[PDB]
Amino acid sequence: SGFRKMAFPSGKVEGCMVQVICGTTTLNGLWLDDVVYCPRHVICTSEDMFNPNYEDLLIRKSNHNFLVQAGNVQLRVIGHSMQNCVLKLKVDTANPKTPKYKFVRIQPGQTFSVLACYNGSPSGVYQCAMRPNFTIKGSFLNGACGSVGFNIDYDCVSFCYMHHMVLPTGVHAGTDLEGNFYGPFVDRQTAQAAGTDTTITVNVLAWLYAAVINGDRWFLNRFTTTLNDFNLVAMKYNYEPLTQDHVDILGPLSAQTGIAVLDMCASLKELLQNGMNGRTILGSALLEDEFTPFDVVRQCS
Amino acid sequence: SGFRKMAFPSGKVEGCMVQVICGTTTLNGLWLDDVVYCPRHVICTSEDMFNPNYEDLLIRKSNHNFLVQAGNVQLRVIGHSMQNCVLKLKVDTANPKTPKYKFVRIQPGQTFSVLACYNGSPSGVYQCAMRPNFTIKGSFLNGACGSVGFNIDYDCVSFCYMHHMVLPTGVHAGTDLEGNFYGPFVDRQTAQAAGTDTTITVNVLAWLYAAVINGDRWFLNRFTTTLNDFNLVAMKYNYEPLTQDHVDILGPLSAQTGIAVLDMCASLKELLQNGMNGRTILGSALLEDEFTPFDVVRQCS
C-alpha cells in the first residue's frame, strides 16, 4: 500500500560522481568510460560568468588545468573538448563501475531522479519533474553544479539532466548529457526569463488515479465532461491542454480503477472551479503535477 | 537554493539487499558480514499468520529451508536463529560490499531513508519519518517486507528500520535491526490499534524555518508567545508539546535566520487558529512534520 514521491536507486550513479576542479571552481562530473562530463562554466571565473566567450576561454585553458578526482584517485585529462554547453574531459583510466547508460533527452513533463553532489561526493536524491517551462524546482546549492538527473530503465541508467545554474527566479535550469540546454536558458549570468509555468494535466490525472487505488475517492463526481470544454476550463487555470494521446497514456489506470479518463477530467473541473475546500488527496491540500502515469503504474502495482 | 524531501544515497544499502525464500514466502533480507537479517514471518504460511507461535514454527523449519540469493548467487544457511521478531540467518560467504554499519533505534519523530525492494532487488528510495504513534506512512506492497530504513552518518550507514507488516489502517509498521517492534504492534494478522497520530511540532518549526531561508515569509507575524500557552493551543490541534530541549535544537536555525524560536511558535499559533487561507509555504497548503531540524540544516546549508 501507499504512494509518495519515490526516486530511483542512486547506487549505479554514485560510482560516476567525480569532482572537477579548474582553478577556483569546484563542481561535479560524470565519469562514464574514459570521458568526464561537467558543465562548461568550470572554465569561467566569476566576472567572466557575465559575458563568457567559452570558445576563447577554452583556448586559454590547457589539459593540465582540469583536475579530476574520483574519491581520492586522480585522472589525467589527455584531451579537453566542449560539446555545446558541456565539457567532455577525456581521461586515462576508464571507470570500472560504469553502468549500462544512454544519453536521452526528456519531454516537458517527464520525471527523473537527481543525485545532488558537492565536492564530487553525493549528498541526496529526490524525484524532480521537467516543468512545462523547462525549469526544475529542486534543491541545488553553490556546489550542486554538475549533478545529473537519471531514469533507470531495467538495468540501463538513462541520464537526462545536468544541473548548470540557478536562475534568479529561484528555480533551476540545466541541460541533457550532450550539451543542449532545456528551454531558453544560456550559461551566462544575465537576467533570463523562465516563463509562465503551467500545470501538467496528464500528470495530475495520474495522481488522481493513484488516489482511487489507495482510498482517496472524495473528489470523484457523478458528472462527466468532454475533452474540449474541459480544456476551456483547464486553459483558464493555466493547465496543459489534455490530448487524446494522453488519454491513451491513462489507459491502464482507467482499466484497473474502473473510472473513465473523461470522468476524471470532470472531477478535476470541480476541483478547480469549486476548489478543494481543504482536504487530503493522498496527503496534500493542493494538486500534484510531478507524477507521470508511468510512475503511478510502477509504484501502485 | 531550494528545499524538498531528500533521502540518503542508497548505494551502500543496495549491496546488502538479498531475497530470502522460505517455501512460498518471498521477502527481502539484509546481508551484513555473514548474517542475513529478514522478518521472522517468512516461516509463516498464510493461515499461520493469524495465530503464529514462532518458537514452534521455527522448530519445524530447518537450515536448508531458507534460500538466500544475492542477485544470482546462493548463500548456505549454516545456522538459523530468531532475535525477537527478526531472523538472523548465518550464511557462508561474507558480503564484500558490507559498509560500515551500526544498528540504532530511532526516537519518535526522527526521519530516515527507506530503500523499498521486491524479490531482493531495490525498487526506490524515499524519506520517511517515524510518526509519534510509531507508524510510518510509506509505499510498501506485497513484497516490500524486509526493506530497511537507514540514515547515513558520515561514512557509517545506520540501519534503524525494517518493514514488517501493513496495518489495516493503511499505514505501516516495522522494527529496528535487532528485533524489537516500533510501537504496540506484533507480527500477527490481528486487528491492532495504531493510535491517534499527533503532529511533530519541533519538526514543523524547522520546516517553517527553512521557508524563511528560501523566501517564504508570509506566515511570519509581529506577535510573540510563551512556551506554555502555545502548547495549550498546540495540544488542542493534536500537536506534540514543544520542549525546551527542542528549543535548543532549533538554535542554529534561529541564529541563521534571525527569528527567535518563540516568535515562530506565535506564527504557528495563527497558522492553526486562523488557518493558512490557501498559500504555498515552500509549496504545500498544509504544514509538514516530516522534516527534522537536522535535515533542514544539512540541506539548507
Residue numbers in the entry:
A (entry chain A), B (entry chain A): 1 to 301
What does the paper say about this structure?
The main/3C-like protease (Mpro/3CLpro) of severe acute respiratory syndrome coronavirus 2 (SARS-CoV-2) is responsible for making 11 out of 14 cleavage events for liberating and activating the viral non-structural proteins essential for the virus replication, and accordingly, it is an important target for antiviral drugs (1–4). Clinically relevant SARS-CoV-2 Mpro inhibitors, including nirmatrelvir, the active component of the Food and Drug Administration-approved drug Paxlovid, and ensitrelvir, which has been approved in Japan for the treatment of coronavirus disease 2019, target the cysteine protease active site of Mpro to competitively block its catalytic activity. Multiple studies have identified an Mpro mutation (E166V) that confers strong resistance to clinically relevant inhibitors, including nirmatrelvir, but the underlying mechanism is not fully understood. Glu166 is also hydrogen-bonded with the N-terminal Ser1 of the dimer partner to stabilize the Mpro homodimer and intramolecularly with His172 to stabilize its active site.
Initial attempts to crystallize SARS-CoV-2 Mpro with the single E166V mutation were not successful possibly due to compromised protein solubility. We reasoned that suppressor mutations, such as T21I and L50F, which have been shown to rescue the severe fitness defect of the virus carrying the Mpro E166V mutation, may also mitigate biochemical defects. The structures of Mpro QM, E166V/T21I/L50F, and E166V/L50F all show a symmetric homo-dimeric assembly very similar to that of the wild-type enzyme. The electron density map shows that the substituted Val166 in the active site takes the rare gauche+ side chain rotamer (χ1 angle = +60°). As expected for the substitution of a non-polar valine residue for glutamic acid, the E166V mutation abolishes the intramolecular and intermolecular hydrogen bonds with the side chains of His172 and Ser1, respectively, which stabilize the S1 pocket of the Mpro active site. Ser1 maintains its proximity to the active site within Mpro dimers through alternative interactions. In particular, E166V, E166I, and QM showed ~25-fold reduced kcat compared to wild type, and E166L showed even poorer activity with ~65-fold lower kcat than wild type.
